[model samples]
Target chain A: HSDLGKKLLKAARAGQKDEVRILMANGADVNATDIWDATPLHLAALIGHAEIVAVLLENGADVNASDITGTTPLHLAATMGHDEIVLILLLKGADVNAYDLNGATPLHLAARMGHKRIVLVLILAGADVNAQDKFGKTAFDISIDNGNEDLAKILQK
Target chain B: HSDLGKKLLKAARAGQKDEVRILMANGADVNATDIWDATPLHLAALIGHAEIVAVLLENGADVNASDITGTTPLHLAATMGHDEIVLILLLKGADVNAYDLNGATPLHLAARMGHKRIVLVLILAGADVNAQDKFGKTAFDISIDNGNEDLAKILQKQ
Candidate 1:
């Protein structure tokens, strides 16, 4: 029944622009997190809501706020194949090299999932293309493991 | 270029047991080698054709004769998870401890591949459970490396 706190999460998840704005104007906390340590911006970026993400970042949402598993919004965006959100997050100063618990960077997640366009986006955004996971597997290693030779060729370059 | 050579290879590959017997009776060389050094027994055991494999074994197929890459019939059978063919080859004296070009024994291949039944069969048949590959990986090491804790437990039992 709490107005601003509950409404902020709901509006952010549902991508309600005016409701989010009205809640933010009424002192909603953009940094509010759910049980998984995922903030409102994390949800928006994960679901590819580029405009809502812009709104949250404009109001002091932490772009690199990691979830319980150390998944930053950029990590989520790349893993979910949200290329536009990835581009926006990178433009807003997201740390492209941030790693998860497994030492897998956003580029590693993107490559392991075979997201060709997102892989290019990260490489152009100055991501450390040679970043490796805890298992000593790079994004290139993941591309090969996933049987995507084309993506592996791109990562090799 | 004998008709029997081509027919024997084809019958074994197609699991035609009667045709294999007929070809062998007409003087198909039991030990004939292909370009890859694979015998008809190699193809039969690889495809899990136990009856054809049995026919070849009785007719003087070289059980331990390996291909250019050092893969024996036992290696093929174990890797393909054909438990029956593996048992027959083992009884016919297939080298359980034989190493391939990579130094991987039958146990090493089955363990790394997570074939639980094949691993058990090899172990019970007295395979060298501690055999290592060229990478210095034992079957135990492979099981652990590939995250198969259950297989690691069984391989460690001996």
Candidate 2:
């Protein structure tokens, strides 16, 4: 109750879809941030709350917004296989090839960890399969090191 | 009437390599799902048991089978940054872009949780930088909303 924005972030993180609708309708900022400077959309994507992610996006949350660590909700969702949320963001103008502070992309995160389905969709979306981070390592390199041949094979294309 | 698969699941969760091997030799159903829909591979990946994951895969487990919530073993390993387990699953043909019941992919979860290494790997694997869920959100969108411009830019396909 102290801060509507903070509360909105909390509710989004907690998957309280109804509460998110009420708060945003009651003038809660969709871009409202928490102590970590994370927005409601960020919290929802971070925890894999698809419904909350939908509500926040519908309410016009900044899909491109970032937190203190320069990480976006996409980065969070990508790592854990939030397939639908990732698609929703993309449809709504979310960046598909953006890099983080370390020069890593959502595609890079998924490949390194062996998320094959994610690897396929991101490729379908035209992710720069050869994109490299500051370390000069592409997702292909990461996949190879991680023993993900399928992921590496796709990255090679 | 306890199934050998259940025993294998428990051993995998506990990281008991010897017991898992013995159970496998005894014809444990490596692909069996428990009441929660979690298989032995799921339990192993959830707990970061790389060896158990390898053993399960060797025994012909389904790498892409999701639990009741549509969470594949790859998702669990990626969520926890279990690099070895994640790699093992991928090698075994796990769907990297699989969406949970909530439509979230492993790539989406890694970025939000600040698992930097995982994020890079997913990108290289070609995870849809622009794929959306029921909510019209992409991993890039999620990354940006969380203050991760770099992630967003990478997803931009430029």
Candidate 3:
């Protein structure tokens, strides 16, 4: 029942910047969402296509676009620890603390996997260090609970 | 046939120190390894038998003895990050930097798991932080491999 939706899915997955540019330039819904509700910008960010991400954001794609899962491109950027990509998105006025399908904020993802440097950057950029996911674990608490002392020290008073 | 050994085995598993002592005093070998070659002391330490560990050390048990897989009691202690038991074992001359089945020194285990305090203690006690495990992952390298930037920074040579 969702055949045409699959074309955008494939384009997003392929990182086909040219095809995407062509589609968007020719007046395809620049903000088109598949059945999963992720825009093409979500695909570009998730796949680490820096140029495509910029194109989508410049075309008035919601840099902070939320899918049906409530995940924004910033969430994916944070998880990958792509600091520059994150910075670019943040500069475009992205919502840094937005939660996703897993109920994980970018900070929570950064904390759980012990990415100390990124957590610090995100915290400094005003990402919520005390924010909790569905599991009730905060960035600082997850590090403390996992015994990752270095990450725990990031938020210590 | 091996069931006679199970009395010490059960006592060791249960942390029954007095029973362990009585059995050993009644001619049970203190270092008897079961079918898999794990000593009763290994059992005591694995099960957190502080008293039995002390008794075994007093009775001349090998501090660095290995099980069938060549895993040391220090391996369990280090992996579990038990600071006090690690101190006890180290004081009793367990090989602080010895390689177990994985060729991993206690320091390697601590660093990979980001147990900074454990890493510090082992390093201060003279473990070679630069030594590599079987996977060729040195303590320094595992910290970096895990992208634990703080660990990398500390272990990073200036």
Candidate 4:
């Protein structure tokens, strides 16, 4: 609601890690939602700003805050293949099985995007391999559809 | 690919039980996928033609056939609240947790559409109540979102 909150969001989206810290020190609302319901953490995660994500999460950002499409920051991280950001979010207690409006979980996005490392990380962190989308396809199904045999193998395991 | 297959698809969609039977008798491919990859079984389940559904299943229809969106006969039947058709499909080995392109299972659709009976039937038939859609919401989550208290109550019973 405050200008500091908006500035923090902008700075986070632009990957200004120092600026994010300064804004937070000034008492900015860490959980500010933008027009699309994206918070600073969501922007940082989507833009692959790992350091800014860490700063925001440390300052009390809502790890599981979903945007307009019910996409959490972890969803953006997984979809954009930001492995570091994804791990950071998961470590912060982001719902590994959190799904968006399309019923796609972080694992589903990681699988579809062919981020094998992220897929493995998510699996190791307790992502449900059998979680299906609205299309009735699982992460393994996505791997098969995308023809990523290596990913399919990892997901199957 | 044959005209008989197309005709069978149409007859099934139109709930023409006799026409479906005749087409089957005339060597129609019961598994014919239309322009959208929908087969006779998909259509019969979607259109709520319980008898036609049974007839199509009897004619060797692929019970779990999915269309362009990966939607199976069970998905359509559950979405449309055709309880009888859903039961028929489930009995014929349709995947209870079959999801469509949106990552929604039949139970997800049944819960979202507030089809209490179908939801229960799907659950009893082994639908995974915890099966999450692409959005990460389960059938129980969908029930709570849609404000279907009775449905939510039933879905929450483990």
**Candidate that scores best on TM-score:** 1
Q: Which runs of model 4 end up more than 4 angstroms from their true locations?
A: B1-158
Q: What does DockQ give for each predicted structure?
A: 0.01, 0.02, 0.01, 0.02
User: Compared with the true structure, what per-residue lDDT tens digits does model 4 show for residues A1-157?
Assistant: 4578768877886788889898899899999864346688888887788999999889889999997458899998887889999999989999999998668899998886678899999998999998987757789977775568999888775
lDDT of 3 by residue, B52-153 (tens): 887877777788888644767776667556677677888899898788755878888777556777777787677887787764567887766556667667
Model 2 quality (TM-score)? 0.50
**Alpha-carbon shift of residue B78 in model 1 (angstroms):** 1.0
Across residues B102-138, which tens digit of lDDT does each residue of candidate 4 receive?
Answer: 6889998888667889999998998889888775778
Fnat for the candidates in order: 0.00, 0.00, 0.00, 0.00
* Docking quality category of candidate 2 according to DockQ thresholds: incorrect
TM-score of chain A of each: 0.94, 0.95, 0.86, 0.97
Q: How far in Å is the alpha carbon of B24 misplaced in model 2?
A: 58
Each candidate: chain B TM-score: 0.93, 0.92, 0.84, 0.95
Cα deviation of B7, candidate 1, in Å: 2.0
Candidate 2 accuracy as lDDT: 0.77
Root-mean-square deviation of each candidate, in angstroms?
A: 21.6, 15.3, 18.0, 17.7
| DockQ category of candidate 4 | incorrect
